[PDB]
Design a protein around this ligand. Structure first.
Ligand code: RET
Ligand code: LFA
Ligand code: LFA
Ligand code: LFA
Ligand code: LFA
Ligand code: LFA
Ligand code: LFA
Ligand code: LFA
Ligand code: LFA
Ligand code: LFA
Ligand code: LFA
Ligand code: NA
Length: 265
């Protein structure tokens, strides 16, 4: 199926690769639940006109609590321990570890994380509906092609790469539209909130770039590399989780901070 299974069918997992990964995937959904409550309880702090931003952060949290919990469980129950070999192996009776919970969680989240900036910041010469439609089309295709190429990670790898770049194309378009949005958004706000908008843009830049980094993480050292192992698996799943907290939780926090800062009139 995927590289995670491959490693759990051929070489198996050491007990520390398996516990680490399970522990990191549990942290991912725990944060989402703490985030959900933070966004709900803080909506009283921001003027009515920016509250749609909190509402959207809260629904992204419900989406990511549930599906990152599904994902966590699909990792634990897909592997059983072999006491004779001392490593964890793909359980033929279990479900087989799957990526479809994460990619679905991206597909749902992506219109919402992009739409929500447009409820805090104002455009100048760009058209709102123009920006919205560009966000929703390319963020869907970025993820849908990302999911397709994900099927060919273990099998045909040039399909894994031709697709991963197709999805890069949509990715870079979003970065372009986000960049115009943040610029027009800086016009006619205080220097304080401009600073936050600049933060939001650096965060939006790093946190989203981690995602294709974790896509290639095992092949990043070549087809016979130090990461071609239960190591680039650990690191792939450590990087997704970092990119999940940053792009969903931290991002929504800086937006709520920006909103509050724009209620200094
Ligand atoms: C959790 C919410 C969001 C919006 C997640 C976004 C993820 C990405 C931007 C991932 C992009 C990919 C790229 C650029 C190429 C390989 C396939 C990925 C889906 C990992
Ligand atoms: C600037 C206001 C202070 C920022 C607080 C951010 C709150 C994030 C809530 C989620 C983090 C929970 C981490 C522990 C979960 C385990
Ligand atoms: C604004 C107030 C922010 C408080 C953030 C507290 C988060 C606690 C996370 C779990 C420890
Ligand atoms: C305004 C109250 C802030 C609550 C902090 C966020 C809740 C963290 C739960 C863990
Ligand atoms: C509409 C916001 C909530 C989206 C929930 C998506 C369904 C989650 C499915 C979890 C089980 C797989
Ligand atoms: C349209 C492509 C977007 C990602 C779809 C993911 C669906 C897979 C759901 C996983 C369920 C496992 C059983
Ligand atoms: C404003 C949110 C619109 C998108 C929510 C549902 C996400 C797409 C479902 C697939
Ligand atoms: C300078 C304001 C902080 C921006 C980054 C916030 C997240 C840092 C990691 C915690
Ligand atoms: C657009 C794809 C970005 C991938 C970043 C991976 C960085 C690898 C550095 C070696
Ligand atoms: C926005 C948070 C910055 C995360 C930078 C990447 C963290 C390094 C993890 C890679 C492990 C290999
Ligand atoms: C002016 C911007 C300052 C906002 C600070 C927001 C940083 C909050 C960091 C919360 C980290 C939650 C993740 C916990 C991981 C365990
Ligand atoms: Na996720």
């Amino acid at each position: 199926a995927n590289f995670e299974n491959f490693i759990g069918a051929t070489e198996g997992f050491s007990e520390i690769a398996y516990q680490f990964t399970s522990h990191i995937l549990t942290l991912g959904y725990a944060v989402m639940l703490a985030g959900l409550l933070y966004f709900i309880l803080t909506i009283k702090n921001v003027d009515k006109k920016f509250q749609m931003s909190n509402i959207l952060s809260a629904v992204v949290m419900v989406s990511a609590f549930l599906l990152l919990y599904a994902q966590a469980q699909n990792w634990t129950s897909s592997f059983t321990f072999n006491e004779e070999v001392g490593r964890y192996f793909l359980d033929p009776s279990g479900d087989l570890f799957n990526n479809g919970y994460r990619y679905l969680n991206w597909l749902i989240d992506v219109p919402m994380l992009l739409f929500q900036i447009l409820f805090v910041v104002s455009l100048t010469t760009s058209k709102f509906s123009s920006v919205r439609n560009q966000f929703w089309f390319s963020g869907a295709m970025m993820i849908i092609t990302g999911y397709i190429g994900q099927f060919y990670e273990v099998s045909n790898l040039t399909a894994f790469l031709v697709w991963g770049a197709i999805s890069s194309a949509f990715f870079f378009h979003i970065l372009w539209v986000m960049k115009k949005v943040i610029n027009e958004g800086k016009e006619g706000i205080s220097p304080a909130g401009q600073k936050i908008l600049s933060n939001i843009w650096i965060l939006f830049l790093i946190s989203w770039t981690l995602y294709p980094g974790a896509y290639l993480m095992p092949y990043l050292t070549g087809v016979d590399g130090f990461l071609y192992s239960e190591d680039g698996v650990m690191a792939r799943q450590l990087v997704y989780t970092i990119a999940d907290v940053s792009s969903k939780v931290i991002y929504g926090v800086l937006l709520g901070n920006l909103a509050i800062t724009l209620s200094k009139n």
